[PDB]
Symmetry: D2
Amino acid sequence: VVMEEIIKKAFIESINNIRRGDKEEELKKIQEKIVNAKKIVVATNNQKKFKVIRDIMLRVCNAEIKMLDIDTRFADLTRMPALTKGLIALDIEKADLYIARGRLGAPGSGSMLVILDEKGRVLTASLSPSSVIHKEDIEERIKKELIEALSRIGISILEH
Amino acid sequence: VVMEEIIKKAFIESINNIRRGDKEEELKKIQEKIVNAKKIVVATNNQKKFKVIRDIMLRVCNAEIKMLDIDTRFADLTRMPALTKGLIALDIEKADLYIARGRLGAPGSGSMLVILDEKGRVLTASLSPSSVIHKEDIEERIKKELIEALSRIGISI
Amino acid sequence: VVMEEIIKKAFIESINNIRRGDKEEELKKIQEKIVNAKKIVVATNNQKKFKVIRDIMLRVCNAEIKMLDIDTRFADLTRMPALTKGLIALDIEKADLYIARGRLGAPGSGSMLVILDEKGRVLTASLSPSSVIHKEDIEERIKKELIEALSRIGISILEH
Amino acid sequence: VVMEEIIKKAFIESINNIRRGDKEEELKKIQEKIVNAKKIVVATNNQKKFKVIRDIMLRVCNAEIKMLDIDTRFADLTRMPALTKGLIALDIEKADLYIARGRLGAPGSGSMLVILDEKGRVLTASLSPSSVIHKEDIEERIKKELIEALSRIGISI
Ligand SMILES: Cc1cc(OP(=O)(O)OC[C@H]2O[C@@H](n3cnc4c(=O)[nH]c(N)nc43)[C@H](O)[C@@H]2O)c(C)c(=O)[nH]1
Ligand SMILES: Cc1cc(OP(=O)(O)OC[C@H]2O[C@@H](n3cnc4c(=O)[nH]c(N)nc43)[C@H](O)[C@@H]2O)c(C)c(=O)[nH]1
Ligand SMILES: Cc1cc(OP(=O)(O)OC[C@H]2O[C@@H](n3cnc4c(=O)[nH]c(N)nc43)[C@H](O)[C@@H]2O)c(C)c(=O)[nH]1
Ligand SMILES: Cc1cc(OP(=O)(O)OC[C@H]2O[C@@H](n3cnc4c(=O)[nH]c(N)nc43)[C@H](O)[C@@H]2O)c(C)c(=O)[nH]1
Ligand SMILES: Nc1nc2c(ncn2[C@@H]2O[C@H](COP(=O)(O)OP(=O)(O)O)[C@@H](O)[C@H]2O)c(=O)[nH]1
Ligand SMILES: [Mg+2]
Ligand SMILES: [Mg+2]
């Protein structure tokens, strides 16, 4: 069943006041979109943030993965920089998923990593404190944010 | 030093390719906005949700804390329901801080708890998976979400 | 050539600070999207708005055109209700274009008619005052809105 | 009565499915916020957009009026740049009214002039076609946009 249909049903539940959380069928659909993706676009500058994310994604899918270099001055004055980044990618490349990483909200708010589908829907995301608290190397943070973003919707990065 | 000024300095750092992450002064300003709020709106009309959140906030600040008048479940038809719940609150009550908890994104995407300031800025947030994964009490979950949203910007219970 | 590439060119003009207005290639692409649509969804439950819109759109394209079948009234709790409606249609139906009409922003701000494509981009739009001021039948207002929305991006609705 | 309270009444009409169009009381409130503004910010660092808009607003109010120190061109890669510009002004400046002018949506979609209040709500707005269609100077178009935005909410010169 198409994604549009599963979503119309969750919306009807809410109108009729009987919506009692996320459903199994919904999680399954999000899993499918991710593992069967054919094209993925990652929004970063920097050839080594790209490498951490590409090596993790090749473990869950058989997709072509392309970097896209976003002049970030055009995202970091918006209300929600990471989310802005993914949508910039959405407008200028055809793909099945878009992954981006940046400031969550107002300055001092820390990090967000987010995954969008081909219509801009937020499928999953992950968060980190300001580096002034967690004090980890940016590469190591990206790894953890990705692994948790995949696992909270049911995709394990371990051997099957 | 007022919030407008701190954000201007951060914005001009980004214009000049000098921004190297969140600064000390930015964390301290957020911390202050939260511990010094005189009025907090919880963007909900479910009494269970309201109660866990009111009781926790009462340990970090000294504010009047009220729930909303109308059902925020109608936010569940937008792209980012939790976010929408905050902005609904902001439209219909004056307050220094708005707290809202709902679905993150599309159906299946789990939870988001977010804290907004009086102009709708996003100060901090935390996320959980769908409950069919974590299998916890909703009151337990809200409790862990709020504690993490505070500790990540440097407030400890 | 594809919409992603045309938008990329425009984004690279802004980055390089030589973006001195919309380009003819941009207008042509938007016209083409509208003229060649096969499926259109009108994000309304009002049979009177639907009819003005369907009778006008049939003059410029040869598409299947339908309305939305869940309640749209809850859009009126959000910041930009006409927009929200278009995005609710996007999320629950497959189509090449979405057309919505509602309140512009805050209570008292009048009406917006808006047109989105399959990825949620805003292609064109038009406004009316509150009817406390303009005082006209709704059908007449819908008609004028749609006509201006189409012609400001270069689609003539007249004889020929 | 305050804006929050007028907005809550309208939201309750929608929930009970009795809302129609705009109310008289709502128009008067918006009129009153604009005519009595003490501080207006024009969301731009371009002097030419600033003068046209400053000159028109002085025909309807007695506000102090300012522009910004930073360029708002950095909004032009978002989905709705004119909106984004207004929100960038709201984040770095306290005012009663914010006025912004930019692209409506996607490239080729024309222009939008938009007015926000102190919490970011959209009060009124005006659109033009791309200039390759209308062919007029930018100072003339901005002048037309602003005059229509005020008259559509009932403020005339
Ligand atoms: C993950 C998710 C949250 C959500 O919004 P909420 O207002 O937080 O939750 C609506 C209902 O969904 C169920 N639920 C949400 N979170 C939880 C949870 O963490 N543990 C349990 N047991 N149940 C939950 C409860 O019945 C809630 O009352 C909605 C509407 C959704 O579709 N998915
Ligand atoms: C939290 C935050 C993130 C952010 O955007 P990003 O693209 O993720 O980071 C831009 C720079 O900000 C710093 N930074 C962000 N997160 C981290 C991190 O987790 N560890 C380290 N060492 N540094 C980081 C790095 O120097 C990056 O090169 C920006 C732009 C911001 O203001 N705050
Ligand atoms: C319609 C449109 C507007 C727009 O942003 P703006 O800040 O309003 O204008 C950017 C440049 O686009 C040109 N422009 C915009 N509106 C006009 C106009 O009404 N008349 C003329 N002659 N030119 C205009 C000017 O060169 C502006 O400096 C952008 C960035 C865009 O891509 N399209
Ligand atoms: C200006 C405005 C519009 C609006 O939403 P809409 O879907 O555009 O219109 C809602 C109802 O308000 C009335 N109405 C709206 N626009 C018009 C109009 O232009 N002429 C007339 N006669 N009536 C109108 C009709 O009863 C509509 O069905 C809402 C919900 C609002 O609060 N304000
Ligand atoms: N009797 C009556 N019903 C109305 C009027 N305006 C709207 N309605 C009802 O409300 C429905 C929704 O219309 P509207 O909210 O404009 O549609 P939307 O564009 O889907 O939001 C209509 O189809 C009518 O049944 C009116 O003036 N009189
Ligand atoms: Mg309606
Ligand atoms: Mg003919």
